[PDB]
Amino acid sequence: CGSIVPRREWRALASECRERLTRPVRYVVVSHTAGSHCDTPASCAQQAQNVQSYHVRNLGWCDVGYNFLIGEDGLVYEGRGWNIKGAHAGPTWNPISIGISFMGNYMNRVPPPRALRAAQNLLACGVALGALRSNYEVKGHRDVQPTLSPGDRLYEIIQTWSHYRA
Template structure:
C-alpha cells in the first residue's frame, strides 16, 4: 500500500499544480516525479552536460503505455532495467520520461548526459513518451506535461531560449517517436527538422 501512496500523492500534486520541478527549486515548473518515488536503481552515470543545451530530442519507448502513476512508475522501472541491465548503459537512457498519467518521471535529470540519440547526447535533453505512438496519439495531459517540462528547462536556464526541438527520427535512423507523436511535435514551437 505504501508503494501506491507516493505515486498517488504526485498525481494529486499534478492535478493541483503545486509541486516544484526539483527539490529545493522554487520555479513555475510542474511536478517531476523524483527517481526515489518510482524506485529507480542507483545511477552510475557521471558525464555532465554543458548547460544550457541547445536541443531537445523527443522519442517514444515503443513499449507498453501507462496511464496511472502506479503503472507509469512500473514502466519507468522496466525501461531502466532494459537500458541498464540488457544494453549495459549507466542508467535509463533518457533525461525524462512522460507518462500518459500526465506526470514527468525523472530519468537522468537536467544535468547528466543521456544515451537517447547517438551524436546528440552531449547537446540535447532527451524526453521520451512511455508507449508506442505509431498509430495513436499520447493523451493530451502527457503532451501538456512535456510542453511544461520544456518551458521549465528554459526557465531554469538548462535549455537555451532559442532551443531547437527535434523528433528522434530527425537525428537517427528510427521510427521513434512514432508517426502520430511526430505529427504533433512538428507543430510545436521551436521544432526544426
C-alpha cells in the first residue's frame, strides 16, 4: 500500500502491545529518533532493530514506541502500525495520533527527498485504507512535547506541508 517493510523483514521482536487506536486517527506527530542515520535497506533494518531494542530491552516498552519509522533509504519501517497506540508524544497525544519517526538526528541535516516522499506516501496510504482522517493534521514532536525532535532542519520542512498545523 505504501511499500512498508514489515516487522519480520527488519527482524523485529514480537510486540506485546494491546491498547488500540480509535481509527480514523486525526493527528500525525513527526519525530526524529535522535539515533544513527542509515541510507541502505541493510543499514535501516539494523537501525529499526537498534531503536526497538532500546525501547523494549532498556525502557521495558511493549514494542518500538513509533507507529512507523522512515529511513534515509526512502523506505517506511512498520512499527506499532495503524491500529495500536504508540509511545512517542507522551500521554495526551499517544492515544489520538500516529507517530512517524525519521531515523537520525536532523538538527543540522535534512532527510533526503526520498525519505520525505516515503512519509507523504505513508500518510496518503493511511487515508487510503481509512487509518487516518481525510483532513488529518501533522504536528512536530516539539509542538506537543518539550524536545528538539524532529530537529531544526526537518521541523522547517514539515512546517511547509499542506497538512501541517502549528
